[PDB]
C-alpha cells in the first residue's frame, strides 16, 4: 500500500511537464485522487481534484485552465499535465489518496522552473574528517551515499547562478542527480 510520485525536474518557464503517481496495494479505481503542492518553505496547497473511477474534476485557480489532471484505472497510475509553467508552480508536488481510510501520501517529487540551463553536479574530493564537494548543479536535488569497500549531508548554497553542497562522514562518494549520477573516492 504505497504511492510513488515521479516525473519532476527542471523545465523552462512557460513550458509543460507531465507528473506521474504509481499506485499499489489497493483498488485504485474506487478512491478519489488529489494533487497537492507546496512552495519551498511556504504552506501547503491543493492543486487538482480527480474523483474516483469516475470523471469529476476540480482545479486550483492558480492552475485553472492551465494544468490538466487525468488517471488510468487499469495501470493504477495518476497523471497531472502542467502547462504554462511559472515560478509560482516551482514546488513539491504530492499525490494523495482521498478516501474512506486514512489518506495515503506518497513521497513528492520536485518541479523547478529555472532561468538557467540545466546542469549536472561536479564532484571534487576534500581531505584534511573527510568529505565530498558537489557544486555547479541544477536543480537542487542533491543526495549523498557514502558506500565504501573494505552519514548526513549539508544544505546547498547559491553561487554565481548555480548551487553547491557538501557533506562528511564520521571518524568513495556517490551522489544521485537527474542530470547525472557522479562518483568520487577520497584517501
Amino acid at each position: 500500500v504505497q504511492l510513488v510520485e515521479s516525473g519532476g525536474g527542471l523545465v523552462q518557464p512557460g513550458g509543460s511537464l507531465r507528473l506521474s503517481c504509481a499506485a499499489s496495494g489497493f483498488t485504485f479505481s474506487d478512491y478519489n485522487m488529489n494533487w497537492v503542492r507546496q512552495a519551498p518553505g511556504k504552506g501547503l496547497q491543493w492543486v487538482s481534484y480527480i474523483s474516483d473511477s469516475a470523471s469529476t474534476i476540480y482545479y486550483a485557480d492558480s492552475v485553472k485552465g492551465r494544468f490538466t489532471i487525468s488517471r488510468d484505472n487499469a495501470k493504477n497510475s495518476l497523471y497531472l499535465q502542467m502547462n504554462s509553467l511559472r515560478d509560482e508552480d516551482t514546488a513539491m508536488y504530492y499525490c494523495a489518496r482521498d478516501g474512506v481510510g486514512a489518506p495515503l501520501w506518497g513521497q513528492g517529487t520536485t518541479v523547478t522552473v529555472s532561468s538557467g540551463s540545466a546542469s549536472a553536479p561536479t564532484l571534487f574530493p576534500l581531505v584534511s574528517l573527510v568529505g565530498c564537494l558537489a557544486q555547479d548543479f541544477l536543480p537542487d536535488s542533491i543526495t549523498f551515499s557514502w558506500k565504501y569497500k573494505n552519514t548526513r549531508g549539508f544544505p546547498s548554497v547559491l553561487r554565481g547562478g548555480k548551487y553547491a553542497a557538501t557533506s562528511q562522514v564520521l571518524l568513495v562518494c556517490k551522489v544521485q542527480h537527474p542530470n547525472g549520477n557522479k562518483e568520487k573516492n577520497v584517501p
Binding site: 488529489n34 497537492v36 507546496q38 504552506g43 501547503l44 496547497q45 491543493w46 481534484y49 476540480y58 486550483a60 504530492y94 482521498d98 486514512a102 489518506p103 501520501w105 513521497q107 513528492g108 571534487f124 574530493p125 576534500l126 581531505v127 584534511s128 574528517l129 568529505g131 564537494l133 557544486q135 548526513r152 549539508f154 544544505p155 546547498s156 548554497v157 547559491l158 553561487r159 553547491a164 553542497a165 557538501t166 562528511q168
Partner: protein, 212 residues
C-alpha cells in the same frame, strides 16, 4: 472558505502546545492535522477531528467544534518542533481540500550545543580546473544562528564568502556551511587560511595549510 492559523507558536519543553485553526462553522466539517518537520514530507498526525493514526503518540489530541479546530500537543518535546497544517475535507465545495497557512511550532529552552567545525581546502583536482573553493562545515549546534568570519592569515576577507542558512537535522540541531571562493594564485601566495565560526559570542578555531 478561509482557514486561519497563527503563524508562529512557541512553548517550553513539557508544556502544552495548542494549535488553533478557525473557520465559519468548521466544526460541521472534518479537519485533519499534518505535521511536517523541515526536510521531510508531511505526516498525518490527526485525521477526522479527534482520531489519531497508528504510531502517533497519545499526547497528540484533536478537537473540532463551533468555529475552531485545535491540535493540542501535550508534554511537548523538541522532536515535535515542526510545521503543523490543518486541512478541511468537504465533498461539496469546488475546493474539496483546503489547507491552512500553517503554524511552525518552536520548542524554546533547548540545550545548547557547541558547533563542530571542519575546514576543508581546495582539491588537487580543483586547482587543475582553475578553481579554488574553501569549505567550512558546521554541525550539531544550537541555536541555529552562527556568523562565519573568513580570515586569510592575519588579514580578513570579504569577497568570495557565501554562507548558507542553517537547516535543522534529525537531532533537532542545526547544520550550516560556508564557502570561500578564491583564485589559485592567492591560494599558494598566502601560507594559511582560517574559518572563524562565531557562535553565541564564542568563536572556534579552524585553519588549513596550503603546503599540504
Amino acid at each position: 472558505y478561509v482557514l486561519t492559523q497563527p503563524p508562529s507558536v512557541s512553548v517550553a519543553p513539557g508544556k502544552t502546545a495548542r494549535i488553533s485553526c478557525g473557520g465559519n462553522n468548521i466544526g460541521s466539517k472534518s479537519v485533519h492535522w499534518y505535521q511536517q518537520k523541515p526536510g521531510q514530507a508531511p505526516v498525518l498526525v490527526i485525521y477526522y477531528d479527534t482520531d489519531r493514526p497508528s504510531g502517533i503518540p497519545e499526547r497528540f489530541s484533536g478537537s473540532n467544534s463551533g468555529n475552531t479546530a485545535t491540535l493540542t500537543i501535550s508534554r511537548v518535546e523538541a522532536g515535535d518542533e515542526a510545521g503543523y497544517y490543518c486541512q478541511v475535507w468537504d465533498s461539496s465545495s469546488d475546493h474539496p481540500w483546503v489547507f491552512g497557512g500553517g503554524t511552525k511550532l518552536t520548542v524554546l529552552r533547548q540545550p545548547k550545543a557547541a558547533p563542530s567545525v571542519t575546514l576543508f581546502p581546495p582539491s588537487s583536482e580543483e586547482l587543475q580546473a582553475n578553481k579554488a573553493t574553501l569549505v567550512c562545515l558546521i554541525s550539531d549546534f544550537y541555536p541555529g544562528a552562527v556568523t562565519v568570519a573568513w580570515k586569510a592569515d592575519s588579514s580578513p576577507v570579504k569577497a568570495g564568502v557565501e554562507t548558507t542558512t542553517p537547516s535543522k537535522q534529525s537531532n533537532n540541531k542545526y547544520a550550516a556551511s560556508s564557502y570561500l571562493s578564491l583564485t589559485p594564485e592567492q591560494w599558494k601566495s598566502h601560507r594559511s587560511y582560517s574559518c572563524q565560526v562565531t557562535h553565541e559570542g564564542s568563536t572556534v578555531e579552524k585553519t588549513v595549510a596550503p603546503t599540504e
